[PDB]
Design a protein around this nucleic acid. Structure first.
Ligand SMILES: [Mg+2]
Ligand SMILES: [Zn+2]
Ligand SMILES: [Zn+2]
Lengths: 1270, 109
DNA sequence: CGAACCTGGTCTTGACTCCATTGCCGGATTTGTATTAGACTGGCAGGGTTGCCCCGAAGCGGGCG
DNA sequence: CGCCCGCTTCGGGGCAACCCTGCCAGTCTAATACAAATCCGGCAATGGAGTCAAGACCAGGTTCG
């Protein structure tokens, strides 16, 4: 392959390296622990920075200086030895260290599960005793020599133990003679009867301990004989004395060593093929623990068998050295140098290796040499991963050092810190301010910042206008800011878009492309209608300006990422250019209608005419500037430029009233006429009161039917009118405008009496401590509701606090209830309710204890908001890597499978009541089947977008279920087709053939988190969503049924006992350990005994695990279950997410199948493989003799799905980089670079959007007619 | 205080990266003891050394059979040197006889 | 129409100066190596409290050739 | 008799957001004795590289007969 790495790539094949690869990579052999001469500051020879080994530090100069130009290149100076070349080969040239003793690699030993352990069938607890020189290991044994000198050496053993017994009856005879001397000197004199036999007890105790001596050494000899009989390879001889005696008496017949060279000898003497087939035979016949361990070893054994990898590289003989510029020793200004913390580890390895080499050369005893080899092993282990095994090797200040494994792991490795997210040039940031005079596609830009962004552009341009002699005078002219540079700067800015990042970029609209314009000041002026997409209030938020350069980049910014082209959501298609907040209030006051206002239409006659008609809105505006007409009075104008509503159009004109000439009268207000002049000519008259939902529906209709530029101009006009009438609306806040409810004291007394009676009944022992708390909680909830109700009925409509709320601008009604009235119940730090409760509004001012109670809930909510965010961003991070490979490849899969939609379920009396969640579950979908009813005609044919009018047509015709396509059953190979994905929710049209819909899906799911509280043992929020996507077993596990029938209900000891009575029958499924802390499932009534359950009826109440409903009710029902169960949470927070995003994620969950039977082809049982590979393998192996591998569908969580991907590069860059990297290195798993993070990493063009070859290889020529006319 | 900025200990020059002509140069072949071949491009007018530390790292001689007789140096100092410079031959021979008759009187009695 | 000029350089020749560039050659300094004879004989010593999840290891009660 | 295996528990690695904002961490037997290497300071062979003075030498633009 390419060594200087020109951009031609097809693969990226990792592999376990060998010593003949390592000493072929190198250009030298570093053999001294020196870096730089202390006095001349030049690198040492044969050190860690030697210019002979690693290349010159100076461009085209040798070390002795005898060659100093380009004309001497490629050659080597015959004295210094330094190859004269360019001085960036020190970035790339490597070196190696020839070790004096072999050393095991740490990743294949220490990280669980251990790979040397599974390869050799050794325990890690006992393998650590081998490679750290703590225990011996037998690496070979002679068979037939033991087979006959077993007899000869047991004869010798009998001779030895008979000589032992010669010594032992010498002991017996000698103490027998001394004991008869004890007789002849104890019973021959005058003495005491017990003191004459204390010497009798003495010599007998001597023989007891002496036969203990002889017995223990005979047991030692028996032990060493049993060990020599049962000696075998892969055995461990602990107890040094036994090994030494065993060697020097039985020094033939076996070889046995200690440490990494012995492990290397075992890897030399190891048939992988017969070992592998023995494991195949064990999984062919075994059971239980043996079969599970046989699978877990067959994994790595067949991994080393299938590839061309010898497993000899797991021990290591030559260690390579990273180039000097990657571990650079840079000096700061002032001689305080900066080493790179790898230099010390290499110095430790070089020192210990040279010390080992001199010890072996000098001749040293075995203790010193094995201590030195253990030190060498620990040095290499610290080099590859410091902190892995034992104490991390510290530096000064007790700071653990940074080894090679710590350059990749975690957030500060190369992957998450420098491969994916880079600091970029042509950039800048500032604080933002509101820009209410800008157009939608414009933005502010401070000129003192633009002059530094566009500095090469303005440099070229004011060279071109002869304002500078050359480039250098132009640069100095820029740096002094001579005032014609601003006039040049306008020309270089105009029509050249910039990007506006805002961290944290939660979803796709965090980066948009605006046309810049110059603004006095130093703060970026942002247009106000993108605050909702950016989630940008003006509390001091800051936004980053980028700058696209190339023609492709400017076209992408101008066409894809422009502001006015991205109005709607990506998620639910509602507008985000919708005028919110202030603007909305303004429009509300502009279209509201006041009865009894100045200048109404009254038809009163007899004395005077009606005085309400106005011939034109021009006359109406003149009568409004004079103080006659209010803006909000009901009059009868005669319009000629506005399209009447559908009933009046069909009345006055029937079929074709074209509006620019026609005239028609209407009783409206003047405000609604001025409002409808903002909307375009084709749009009908509205004549309502501009609630925020009404404006959302208007902009959704106007975006679904008109082109985009009309939508942008209409939204801009609504912004201008909304601000201008928001100033006039008079919405102020004064404490005279916060009215208190007059009946409040009576309400508080009436509930205070009930609180007093509950407290009295607790004091008289009629109920315990918890039930009185529950009674008080319910009473004060009732009090809160009554105070809020009286407050709601007390206010007028033109009270500005209730006007802001009931317009829909901002704020719910509970905030008005807490401004005036009652705060209510305030929570505990644990989560319960404080039973006091707070009875003062914030207008009246709280007391000390009430405020101290409120602080609990406030700080709890704020800290919970912080932690959730971290969790919501992390969930998004996981989901992006899960669905990074769902990109739209084909126009049409052309299947016929597809899901059904509930779609306005049946009324009991019998109508078509509309299902409320249709917009998330039915719209923007393409039918696979047709709509037919009562053997009638077709209604909606195959493959239609199925928007609002055709849903209205289906509900008019009277059907309830349509079979529609989905991205669950798109039958394309790699990612979905287009027509299964349906309408792209951002465009309004059909999805393109380059979209990365997995990323849009992941961002729209984990985008609106944050704000997703919890509740008052089912998990009910963001951790519930997370355990759904992780496919966990839930906390409140409620088991589901397995077959129909009546139930065998029983309340056992302190918890339940439920069993299903079968109907064929068969074996009864027994559910024993169901807690009484749970509840039984209620439906339609509670679960009663003898009731007939379904096949997968949920028995108890809580959360069903998706594994069990997969195993019982298959893939379809677990898809329905997951979608319903996630959308239940998001509807509980009231967040519109369309289901196809969740379907994109669930389709990534249900890819793989498991292997319960190998068939006879390549598939290990329990392993998880992709479904398409499984089917293609069965299609290959039905020929050449037919056997099926048996497959079952699995539902796996999203971590394991992301880590068991095909490309090792993405799975290394995601998480668990060490283990992913080491088993990819074992499997020799070649990447194909076909994914989506990999092309981001290696810098080439990603295969989505404008990167795919359907758009990247467009030939663009001038047409021949205009060519001839040119 | 200042600043931060730092430099690698070395200069970065920039000239024409021309490739059409260079200084013409030879190719010599050195050989280790264990059959390894290495090619080293020396310049033309350059006294080519007889031995050369190769890419492998062990000392390699040239493939031309001249063998200029490098006259390899003495062994530095041995335990025999540190013993002989503080004792004498008749004393060491006396001790040799003492251990000789010691293993004799041990063995045959 | 020719004479004589004086001046654009064009180039060379010789004489003189200066200056790098080895070449010894000797002293200064710099770095490596060796050697010190009473006896001296198994480390300090510190931290560490989140929570959750997945998985693998050691062990204990349960039966059994 | 001693023999082995199914659940339990103990332990152990991995992860926990994102913009800016910061800027340089420690300690004791002590010297001689000699030799190779290195370096640096000063004349001494230069001859090459530059510099000036002088002139010969044209062959063409400027002026008198
Ligand atoms: Mg903010
Ligand atoms: Zn050199
Ligand atoms: Zn499809």
């Amino acid at each position: 392959g390419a060594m200087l790495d020109v951009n031609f790539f097809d693969e990226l094949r990792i592999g376990l390296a060998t010593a003949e690869d390592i000493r072929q990579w190198s250009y030298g052999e570093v053999k001294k622990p020196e870096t730089i001469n202390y006095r001349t500051l030049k690198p040492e020879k044969d050190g860690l920075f030697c210019e002979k080994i690693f290349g010159p530090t100076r461009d085209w100069e040798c070390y002795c200086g005898k060659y100093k130009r380009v004309r001497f290149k490629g050659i080597i100076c015959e004295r210094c030895g330094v190859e004269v070349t360019r001085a960036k080969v020190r970035r790339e040239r490597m070196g190696h260290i020839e070790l004096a003793a072999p050393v095991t690699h740490i990743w294949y030993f220490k990280g669980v599960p251990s790979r040397l352990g599974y390869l050799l069938d050794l325990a890690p607890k006992d393998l650590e005793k081998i490679i750290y020189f703590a225990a011996y290991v037998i690496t070979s044994v002679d068979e037939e020599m033991r087979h006959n000198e077993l007899s000869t050496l047991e004869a010798e053993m009998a001779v030895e133990r008979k000589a032992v017994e010669d010594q032992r009856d010498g002991e017996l005879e000698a103490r027998a003679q001394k004991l008869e001397a004890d007789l002849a000197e104890l019973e021959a004199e005058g003495a005491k009867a017990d003191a004459r036999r204390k010497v009798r007890d003495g010599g007998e105790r001597e023989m007891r301990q002496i036969r203990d001596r002889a017995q223990r050494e005979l047991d030692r000899l028996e032990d060493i004989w049993s060990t020599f009989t049962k000696l075998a390879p892969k055995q461990l001889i602990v107890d040094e004395n036994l090994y030494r005696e065993l060697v020097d008496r039985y020094g033939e017949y076996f070889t046995g060593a200690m440490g990494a060279e012995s492990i290397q000898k075992l890897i030399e003497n190891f048939d992988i093929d017969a070992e592998a087939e023995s494991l195949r035979d064990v999984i062919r016949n075994g059971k239980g623990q043996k079969k599970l361990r046989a699978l877990k070893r067959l994994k790595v054994v067949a991994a080393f068998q299938q590839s061309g990898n010898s497993p000899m590289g797991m021990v290591l003989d030559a260690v390579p050295v990273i180039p000097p510029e990657l571990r650079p020793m840079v000096q700061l200004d002032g001689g305080r140098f900066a080493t790179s913390d790898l230099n010390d580890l290499y110095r430790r390895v070089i020192n210990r290796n040279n010390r080992l080499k001199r010890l072996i050369d000098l001749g040293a005893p075995e203790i010193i040499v094995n201590n030195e080899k253990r030190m060498l092993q620990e040095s290499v282990d610290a080099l590859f991963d410091n902190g892995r095994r034992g104490r991390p090797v510290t530096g000064p200040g007790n700071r653990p050092l940074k080894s090679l494994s710590d350059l990749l792991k975690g957030k500060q490795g190369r992957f998450r810190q420098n491969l994916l997210g880079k600091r970029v040039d042509y950039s800048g940031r500032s604080v933002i301010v509101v820009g209410p005079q800008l157009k939608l596609h414009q933005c502010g830009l401070p000129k003192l910042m633009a002059l530094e962004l566009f500095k090469p552009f303005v440099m070229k341009r004011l060279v071109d206008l002869n304002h500078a002699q050359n480039i250098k005078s132009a640069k100095r002219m820029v740096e002094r800011q001579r005032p014609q540079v601003w006039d040049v700067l306008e020309e270089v800015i105009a029509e050249h878009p910039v990007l506006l990042n805002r961290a944290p970029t939660l979803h796709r609209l965090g980066i948009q492309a605006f046309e810049p314009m110059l603004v006095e000041g130093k703060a970026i002026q942002l247009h106000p209608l993108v605050c909702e997409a950016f989630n940008a209030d003006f509390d001091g938020d800051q936004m980053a300006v980028h700058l696209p350069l190339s023609a492709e980049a400017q076209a992408e910014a101008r066409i894809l990422m422009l502001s006015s082209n991205n109005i709607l959501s990506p998620a639910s298609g509602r507008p985000l250019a919708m005028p919110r907040l202030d603007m909305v209030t303004g429009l509300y006051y502009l279209t509201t209608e006041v009865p009894g206002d100045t200048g109404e239409y009254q038809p009163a006659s007899g004395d005077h005419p009606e005085t309400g008609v106005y011939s034109s809105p021009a006359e109406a505006i003149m009568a409004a500037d004079r103080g006659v007409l209010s803006v909000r009075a009901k009059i009868k104008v005669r319009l000629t430029q506005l399209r009447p509503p559908v009933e009046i159009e069909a009345e006055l004109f029937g079929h074709s009233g074209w509006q620019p000439g026609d005239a028609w009268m209407a009783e409206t207000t003047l405000g609604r006429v001025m409002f409808n002049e903002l909307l375009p000519l084709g749009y009908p008259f509205v004549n309502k009161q501009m609630h925020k939902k009404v404006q959302a529906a208007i902009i959704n209709d106007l975006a679904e039917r008109y082109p985009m530029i009309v939508v942008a101009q209409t939204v801009d006009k609504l912004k201008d009118a909304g601000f201008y009438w928001a100033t006039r609306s008079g919405v102020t806040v004064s404490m005279a405008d916060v009215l208190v409810p007059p009946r409040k004291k009576e309400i508080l007394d009436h509930y205070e009496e009930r609180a007093d009676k509950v407290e009295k009944q607790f004091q008289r022992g009629a109920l315990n401590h918890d039930e009185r708390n529950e009674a008080l909680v319910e009473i004060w909830k009732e009090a809160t509701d009554e105070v809020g109700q009286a407050l709601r009925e007390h206010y007028p409509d033109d009270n500005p606090i209730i006007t802001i709320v009931d317009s829909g601008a901002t704020g719910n009604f509970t905030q008005t209830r807490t401004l005036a009235g009652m705060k209510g119940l305030v929570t505990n730090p644990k989560g319960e309710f404080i039973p006091r409760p707070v009875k003062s509004s914030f207008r009246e001012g709280l007391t000390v204890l009430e405020y101290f109670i409120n602080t609990h809930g406030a700080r709890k909510g704020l800290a919970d908001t912080a932690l959730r965010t971290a969790d919501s961003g992390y969930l998004t991070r996981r989901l992006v890597d899960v669905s990074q490979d769902v990109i739209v490849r084909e126009h049409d899969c052309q299947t016929e499978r597809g899901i059904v939609v509930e779609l306005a379920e049946r009324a009991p009396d019998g109508t078509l009541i509309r299902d409320p969640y249709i917009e998330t579950s039915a719209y923007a979908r393409t039918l696979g089947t047709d709509a037919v009813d009562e053997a009638g005609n077709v209604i909606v044919e195959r493959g239609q977008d199925l928007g609002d009018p055709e849903i209205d047509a289906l509900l008019a015709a009277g059907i309830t279920q349509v079979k529609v396509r989905s991205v669950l059953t798109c039958a394309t190979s790699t990612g979905v087709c287009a027509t299964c994905y349906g309408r792209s929710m951002a465009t309004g049209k059909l999805v393109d053939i380059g979209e990365a819909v997995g990323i849009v899906a992941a961002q729209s799911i984990g985008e609106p988190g944050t704000q997703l509280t919890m509740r008052t043992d089912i998990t009910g929020g963001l951790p519930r969503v997370q355990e759904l996507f992780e496919a966990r077993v839930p906390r409140g596990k409620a088991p589901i049924a397995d077959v129909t029938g009546r139930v065998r209900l029983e309340d056992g000891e302190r918890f339940y006992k439920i069993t299903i009575v079968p109907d064929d029958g068969g074996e009864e499924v027994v559910y024993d350990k169901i807690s009484k802390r749970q509840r039984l499932r209620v439906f339609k009534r509670v679960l009663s005994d003898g009731d007939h359950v379904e096949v997968g009826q949920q028995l108890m109440e809580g959360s069903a695990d998706p594994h069990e409903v997969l195993r019982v009710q298959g893939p379809r029902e677990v898809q329905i279950h997951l979608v319903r169960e996630v959308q239940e949470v998001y509807r509980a927070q009231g967040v519109s997410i369309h289901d196809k995003h969740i379907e994109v994620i669930v389709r990534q969950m249900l890819r793989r199948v498991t292997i319960i039977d190998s068939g006879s082809t390549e598939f290990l049982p329990g392993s998880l493989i992709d479904r398409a590979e499984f089917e293609a393998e069965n299609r290959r192996v039905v020929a050449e003799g037919g056997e099926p591998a048996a497959g079952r569908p699995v539902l796996m969580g999203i971590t394991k799905a992301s880590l068991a991907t095909d490309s090792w590069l993405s799975a290394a860059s995601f998480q668990e980089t060490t283990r992913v990297l080491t088993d990819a290195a074992i499997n020799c798993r070649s990447d194909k670079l076909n994914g989506l993070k990999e092309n981001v990493i290696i810098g080439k063009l990603i295969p989505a959007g404008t990167g795919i070859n359907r758009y990247r290889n467009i030939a663009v020529q001038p047409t021949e007619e205009a060519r001839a006319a040119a | 205080d200042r600043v931060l900025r730092g430099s690698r200990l070395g200069a970065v020059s920039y000239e024409t990266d021309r490739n059409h002509d260079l200084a013409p140069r030879q190719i010599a072949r050195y050989r280790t003891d264990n059959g390894e071949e290495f090619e080293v491009p020396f310049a033309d007018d350059a006294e080519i050394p007889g031995t050369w530390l190769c890419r492998n790292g062990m000392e390699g001689t040239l493939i031309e059979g001249d063998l200029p007789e490098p006259k390899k140096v003495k062994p530095p100092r041995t335990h025999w040197d540190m013993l002989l410079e503080r004792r004498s031959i008749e004393e060491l021979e006396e001790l040799l006889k003492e251990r000789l008759e010691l293993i004799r009187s041990r063995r045959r009695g």
